Amino acid sequence: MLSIPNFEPQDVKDVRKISKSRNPFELLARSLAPSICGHEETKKALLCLLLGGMEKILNNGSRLRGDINVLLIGDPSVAKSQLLRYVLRMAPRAITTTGRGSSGVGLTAAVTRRLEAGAMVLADRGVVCIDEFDKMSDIDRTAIHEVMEQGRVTISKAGIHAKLNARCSVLAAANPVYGRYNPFKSPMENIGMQDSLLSRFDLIFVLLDEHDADKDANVAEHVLKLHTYRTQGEADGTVLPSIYEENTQWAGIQDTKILTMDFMRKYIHLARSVQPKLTDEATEYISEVYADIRSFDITKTDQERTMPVTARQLETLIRLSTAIAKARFSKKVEREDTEKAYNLLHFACFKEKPKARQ
Amino acid sequence: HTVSVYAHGSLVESVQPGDRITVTGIFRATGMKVNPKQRALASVYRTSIDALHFRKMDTSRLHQDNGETITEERIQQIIELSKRPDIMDALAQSIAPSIYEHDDVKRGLLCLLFGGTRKDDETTNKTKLRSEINILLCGDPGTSKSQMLQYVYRLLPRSQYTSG
Amino acid sequence: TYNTDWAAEKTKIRSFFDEYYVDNEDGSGKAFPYRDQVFEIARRDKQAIVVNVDHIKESDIPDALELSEAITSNTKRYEVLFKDTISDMIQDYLGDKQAPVIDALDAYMFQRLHMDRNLQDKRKKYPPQLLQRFEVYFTTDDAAHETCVRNIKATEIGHLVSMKGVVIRATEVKPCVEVMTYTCDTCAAEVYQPVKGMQFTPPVNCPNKECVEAKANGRLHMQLRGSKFVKFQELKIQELSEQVPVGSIPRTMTVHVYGEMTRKCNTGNVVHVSGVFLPIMLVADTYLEAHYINNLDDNGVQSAELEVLRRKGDNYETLAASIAPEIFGHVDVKKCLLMALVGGNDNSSNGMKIRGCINVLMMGDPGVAKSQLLGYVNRLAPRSQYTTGRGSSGVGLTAAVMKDPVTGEMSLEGGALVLADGGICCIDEFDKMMDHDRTAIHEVMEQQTISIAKAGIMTTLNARTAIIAAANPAYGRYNPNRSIEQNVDLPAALLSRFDLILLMQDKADRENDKILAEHITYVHQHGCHPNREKKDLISLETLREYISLCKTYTPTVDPALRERIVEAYVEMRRDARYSSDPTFVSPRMILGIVRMATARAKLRLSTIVDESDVEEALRLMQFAKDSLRPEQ
DNA sequence: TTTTTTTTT
């Protein structure tokens, strides 16, 4: 076969050392996609997506979901599609599609008489990337609601009655309702999707292209620095037909070290198999924090709410805690994990009003 | 399920499509050739019925035979019954006894059961003018329209029920 | 390098039948159940023996392991040896007596053996399939023989194999030839031909030596009073969902069933099968020849855990609490589902039929465990189907016309509500179904029939099913500013067909949120519900057993309850006139009251309805009504 | 060939 992991004891030693270092989760999140400036919280979310949570199958056969789902909405030219293509490279068992040219039948399963698999069935125990998600029709969107929660596709049409397993993680990108974010309307108005669909995403990120001379100067300097770069052992006229990185001018980050992508692939492959358990301090912190998030009122602080808050977000807290604990190679989930999970979720949940309205 | 029935001799052409019958006969089994060219047989047999008697008599419905067999005494009882002034109410309220009120609808269904005078060209065996009566019921939910349809469906010998 | 000394193997097999035992439950002695079953065959109270190979494996007998391995490795041969040893045991039991004549073949054999009179002659004249008239089947339970449809390959031909699956297709029972008998015209001799496989070729010319030498040219005529037939059935069996590899579609296999194992399955069942994998008579086609079948839908005996409940009584609160104990709260909703799992009585007064079962509609905000409750109900009910609004057509719910491309024929194919007949259909995402798909269930929910008139087909099908449905309100959330009819965007004709309609809100509250978080985090810690009060709860298996017991009762209504029921109906119908935010009320309501009263009498296992049950039905209807006006 | 049905675009 022509169409993946590899290990040696030196690599295992280095995995032990980096896991025993001070802040491995922050190091991996910084090292994820260096040639894109900013987007640090979204990079942390994508690392949590690549690690994943724990499925629970109870004694009576009941199932609780383990996967993590992420949505990006924002202005044009903010690297949404670029991050989707990067995750498509990094993840094994990954499929990419667009909402522009996908039917819901082709996205889940089809009758052709025979039964025919769709993209989310083919990506079972894997990742689906969907671009231009706002361009999909609602008739196709309503076919996803079973898959994103139960992990199943069920069909009952002429001569065919069948279940199909479709346990996978969804990463989606979209543009807002008006083609460009209106600051005079609320984030829910700009997103323009119903609560039953918005509740199924563990994390939602709103990305804005704000005019601000400091940020414009920094972003333009980073882009031109990545464009003027050439490899150290290369002649000027040429054309394309260990642990740390060594040349980092293209990455923009001045002094702090970055891990090699091959080492990232090996580390994520090993850390995926860790199976941590919960503890009492984590349970108490999660239970208090969930009630505080639900009871917080936004008229105090001149902020506005970005997501619905339901009982699924409690499970999102549990999933993010286990995913953070995996990167430490820890057998137990602790307050150190749950605090980082809460900070990421609280970043996602609330957003200050735009400067055009302020 | 469906079953094949074989009629020999004088039983031939004694029944039409649409009729409801009881059959008495012999249950048989026969073999089948693997190829029509050859002597080999399949070891799973086909089954059918050789008929001996068809019966269509059923007392739970208005009878299916143009009323040839009624006795003189019951004809005289019918003629005596026809002289009640209550004859419309007496016949109408006896139809669909479990249904409460709707007396006007019951009288309409009685008119449907009786019908008009037949007016046919006998040289060509064609209807010159329609003598059958058509009825529409239109109303609120939960008012027993489907139940009245079920009563008329079960009463007659030749009836069909379709829906939606 | 082969063993063919059949007498020693017969000695081993007979020693197994003589020496396997189970101690009596009172300690009074020992039962020898296999030889008891042999004597039942000898006195003709039985037709088959089912042998468990694991009992042979774990018996306290020399060479037991070797015998079990030989049976498993060449099962098609050892069936003959088991039949021979059981025949010898039957003759040793019977002695000089005769077994009773029960059918025409028995009469022919008993008459003809003594016509021959008037062991070498017997065994030469008659084939052993005709001399022996019983069946032998094998079973296994050890996990070494568990396989999928996908794994049965060339190493498994001739071996005993066990698997688990779903039945797609099943034929009706047909007569299958086992032994043909022919008689000669001129010399009156008889020819016996045993049949193996799916074909046979009849002989033409008489073989008897006097006829052949005389050149009498006598034809052979076949006779079906002496010939032997057996029940035959064919199935197609599909892989179970847990057996399939990742990102793959299940496979199927053909199964042949004989004799007493026929009519144990119909379409829509999950089965455990033991059988032998064989070819068809250099590339070969294959099938599975079934030895034993078990319905896992089905499987006077009572468990001790059920005996405790049946002695206790007052079980209603515990039964309500035992439905999906991972889900916190919703006690009245669980009581409504408990009543829908049992239902009322069918009534057929003066030819007019009335539906007995109960219909429930759930609605609520997102994230309030509707799908979890429907999944638990689908696991709990014996025969049940699950569908979603998007994944189903109005032909997949009811029944379809199928045009076979091989023959050109038209046929009918039953949908989900036909397959769920006598049971429960769960419909998720009920608000997202199309109107012209949704209107198919109008006949099923009230008349319990499907009637079709298409192409060259005109029939009626039975669909006696309860429907449990789940939906969201009209814009994904309940709106307290809009009316009940605006929040529940369904027509009145469909709304009148549901006996109960419920709403489940999610509203933020600083104590209830913390209590719910504690419950969910405990479930994620330990894999089971908290049970902080240490009260008893019922296992899923014995809850299924108890509901199956409850369905056997038919409690009658006391005529004293008449005024209470009728006055309640009139009082209910006043408000729909004189309210600012009314709902639709029709004469189906009073039948719903009677249904719920009889359902709770069934749950109590009593035979006469009480006014307490009438009051509980009224309390649940009041709760359902009050759910649709929160904070008013 | 022509006809009738149910899923898909």
Ligand SMILES: Nc1ncnc2c1ncn2[C@@H]1O[C@H](COP(=O)(O)OP(=O)(O)NP(=O)(O)O)[C@@H](O)[C@H]1O
């Ligand atoms: N730091 C950066 N921030 C934003 N964009 C960048 C950055 N560096 C490079 N780009 C460029 O900006 C573009 C990223 O947008 P891209 O991912 O192609 O489409 P998009 O973000 O999904 N917008 P759209 O598809 O129209 O909704 C590419 O041309 C990148 O090369």
Ligand SMILES: Nc1ncnc2c1ncn2[C@@H]1O[C@H](COP(=O)(O)OP(=O)(O)NP(=O)(O)O)[C@@H](O)[C@H]1O
């Ligand atoms: N006057 C009545 N007499 C007898 N039964 C009645 C009466 N009114 C209502 N019912 C009962 O109420 C139900 C009426 O169902 P149904 O026969 O479908 O009425 P319908 O007119 O067809 N409503 P729908 O088909 O939904 O438009 C049945 O259970 C009847 O037994």
Ligand SMILES: Nc1ncnc2c1ncn2[C@@H]1O[C@H](COP(=O)(O)OP(=O)(O)NP(=O)(O)O)[C@@H](O)[C@H]1O
């Ligand atoms: N009271 C509760 N107790 C336990 N788990 C709960 C509770 N409420 C919600 N959940 C969890 O919430 C998740 C979503 O459940 P689900 O059954 O899909 O809700 P839903 O009512 O179907 N929402 P929707 O299908 O979009 O209308 C599951 O993981 C449940 O375990």
Ligand SMILES: [Mg+2]
């Ligand atoms: Mg893009």
Ligand SMILES: [Mg+2]
């Ligand atoms: Mg009706």
Ligand SMILES: [Mg+2]
């Ligand atoms: Mg749901």
Ligand SMILES: [Zn+2]
């Ligand atoms: Zn002869």
